[PDB]
C-alpha cells in the first residue's frame, strides 16, 4: 500500500474497477433503443 | 569505595576533638609561617610541608596554629605552583606510563592502566576549570605533557 | 531497581512505550499488520458466496467430521472456510449461495475441535439458520 497517497490511489483504481464493471451489463435492458421493458403482473 | 579499583578500603587519619594548639608547643603562628616559607623555597609541595612540621617541629595541624591552612599561605605569599598538587602528580605519573609504553608496545597492562590515569586527569581538570583554578582552555594533550611538569 | 528521581518522567514514560511493544495483545491491535491480514478487516460479520462444501476432520482425541463451507468474500475477494453449526444445517445450503459469516468466538483463533477454522455461518440466502433449523421459515430459492 505504502504511504497514504498510494493507498488513496489504490482505493481509486478498485473503486473505478467495480464502478465500471457494474455498468457493462446495465444497458442490457430497456434503453432508448429499447427492447421493451417487459413487466409481468400477477395477482396472488 | 575507591574509584577505579574494586577495593572498599578504610584507612585514613582521625583528627581529635580538642581543636586547640597544645600546651608544650612553643612556636607562634608567625614562626610557623616563617618555617613554611623556607620549606617552600626548598621546593616542596604543600603535602610535604605538613609532614615535615608534624614529624620534626611538633606541629599537629597548621590550620589549628596559624588559623589558615597550607595552600592559602603559599598562594598569599606568592610561592605557589600554577597547576595544583594532585593534578601535577597525575600528569607526572601519566608521563612515566606513556614514556615506558613506547619501549614496550606489547604491554597491555599499562595500556589499560594508562586510561585510568587518563580518566582521572579529566575528572580533576573539569573541577579546576569549574572552580577557576585553571584557565578555561587548559587541556591535557598527550604530546606537550613533558613540558607541563 | 527502577529509576525513582523527580525529573525522571521522560525515562519513565518512554521505557513504558517501548516495553508496551512486547505485549502481544498490544502489538496485534496497534501494529496494523494483523488487520491487513484479517480476512474481514475489522468487521464483526461479512458476506460471501459459497464455493463448495468441504467437510473437515476433528482434531486428535475425539473423532467426527465437521461440515464446513468454502466462502469467497465479496468485499475483498478473500477466501474463508466457515463452519455450518447445527445438525442438518448443511442441507439448507447449496452452492453459489450468499452467506453472512461471523467469527467463531475466539477473535481470530480456532475453536477447539475444528482445525484452522475461525468463522461460522450465520444466515444463508438472507434468512437465518436458526429460523431454518427450528423450522420457523422456508429456504428461499
Amino acid at each position: 500500500e505504502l504511504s497514504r497517497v498510494d493507498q488513496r490511489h489504490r482505493a481509486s483504481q478498485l473503486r473505478k474497477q467495480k464502478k465500471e464493471a457494474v455498468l457493462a451489463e446495465k444497458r442490457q435492458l430497456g434503453g432508448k433503443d429499447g427492447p421493451p421493458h417487459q413487466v409481468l403482473v400477477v395477482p396472488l | 569505595g575507591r574509584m577505579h579499583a574494586p577495593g572498599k578500603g578504610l584507612s585514613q587519619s582521625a583528627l581529635p576533638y580538642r581543636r586547640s594548639v597544645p600546651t608544650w608547643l612553643k612556636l607562634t603562628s608567625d614562626d610557623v609561617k616563617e618555617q613554611i616559607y623556607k620549606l617552600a623555597k626548598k621546593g616542596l609541595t604543600p603535602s610535604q610541608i605538613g609532614v615535615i612540621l608534624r614529624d620534626s617541629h611538633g606541629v599537629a595541624q597548621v590550620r589549628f596554629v596559624t588559623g589558615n591552612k597550607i595552600l592559602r599561605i603559599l598562594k598569599s605569599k606568592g610561592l605557589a605552583p600554577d597547576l595544583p598538587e594532585d593534578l601535577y602528580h597525575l600528569i607526572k605519573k601519566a608521563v612515566a606510563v606513556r614514556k615506558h609504553l613506547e619501549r614496550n608496545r606489547k604491554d597491555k597492562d599499562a595500556k589499560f592502566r594508562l586510561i585510568l590515569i587518563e580518566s582521572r586527569i579529566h575528572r580533576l581538570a573539569r573541577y579546576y576549570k569549574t572552580k577557576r583554578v585553571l584557565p578555561p582552555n587548559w587541556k591535557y594533550e598527550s604530546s606537550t605533557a613533558s613540558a607541563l611538569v | 531497581g527502577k529509576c525513582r528521581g523527580l525529573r525522571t518522567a521522560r525515562k519513565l514514560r518512554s521505557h513504558r512505550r517501548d516495553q508496551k511493544w512486547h505485549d502481544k495483545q498490544y502489538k496485534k491491535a496497534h501494529l496494523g499488520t494483523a488487520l491487513k491480514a484479517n480476512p474481514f478487516g475489522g468487521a464483526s460479520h461479512a458476506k460471501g458466496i459459497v464455493l463448495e462444501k468441504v467437510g473437515v476432520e476433528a482434531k486428535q482425541p475425539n473423532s467426527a467430521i465437521r461440515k464446513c463451507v468454502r466462502v469467497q468474500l465479496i468485499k475483498n475477494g478473500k477466501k474463508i472456510t466457515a463452519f455450518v453449526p447445527n445438525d442438518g444445517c448443511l442441507n439448507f445450503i447449496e452452492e453459489n449461495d450468499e452467506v453472512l459469516v461471523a467469527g467463531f468466538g475466539r477473535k481470530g483463533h480456532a475453536v477447539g475441535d475444528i482445525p484452522g477454522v475461525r468463522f461460522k455461518v450465520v444466515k444463508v440466502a438472507n434468512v437465518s439458520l436458526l429460523a431454518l433449523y427450528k423450522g420457523k421459515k422456508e429456504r428461499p430459492r
Binding site: - | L15, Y17, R19 | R4, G5, L6
Partner: protein, 129 residues
C-alpha cells in the same frame, strides 16, 4: 554513595525494633533527622534521644520503646497539596485512628494532623505508625 541520610537513619531504627534492641546508633545526623525524631517522640513512639557532638556530623543514640511498628521514608519528597493529603494518608497509613505522615511545610516539619490545622501543604518526608 549515601544519597539520603534520612533514609539510612530510619531503616537503622526500623531494623532494630525488629531485632528487639533498646537503643540505636544513627550516624550521621542532619537536622532533618532531629526534627523528624522529635515528632515521633512527641507522639510517644520513641522516647528520649541524645545527640553526640563530634566535630564532623553528629551521631544520635535513641532510646526505643517497643511501640513503633513501622518507620518509613518517601523518596523523592513529592509535593503534597492539602486537597491531595487524603490519598497519601490512605496509601501509607494502616487506619484512620493512628499513624502519622511527616511533611516539611514552610511552618515547620509537622504531622498531617498539624498541617491540616495550620492549613499548609508541603513535601512528604515519611511516615510512622
Amino acid at each position: 554513595v549515601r544519597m539520603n541520610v534520612l533514609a539510612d537513619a530510619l531503616k537503622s531504627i526500623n531494623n532494630a525494633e525488629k531485632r528487639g534492641k533498646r537503643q540505636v546508633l544513627i550516624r550521621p545526623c542532619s537536622k532533618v533527622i532531629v526534627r523528624f525524631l522529635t515528632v515521633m517522640m512527641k507522639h510517644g513512639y520513641i522516647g528520649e534521644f541524645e545527640i553526640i557532638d563530634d566535630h564532623r556530623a553528629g551521631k544520635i543514640v535513641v532510646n526505643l520503646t517497643g511501640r513503633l511498628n513501622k518507620c518509613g521514608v518517601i523518596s523523592p519528597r513529592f509535593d503534597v497539596q492539602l486537597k491531595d493529603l487524603e490519598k497519601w494518608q490512605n496509601n501509607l497509613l494502616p487506619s484512620r485512628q493512628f499513624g502519622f505522615i511527616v511533611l516539611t511545610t514552610s511552618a515547620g516539619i509537622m504531622d498531617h494532623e498539624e498541617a491540616r490545622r495550620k492549613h499548609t501543604g508541603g513535601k512528604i518526608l515519611g511516615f510512622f505508625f
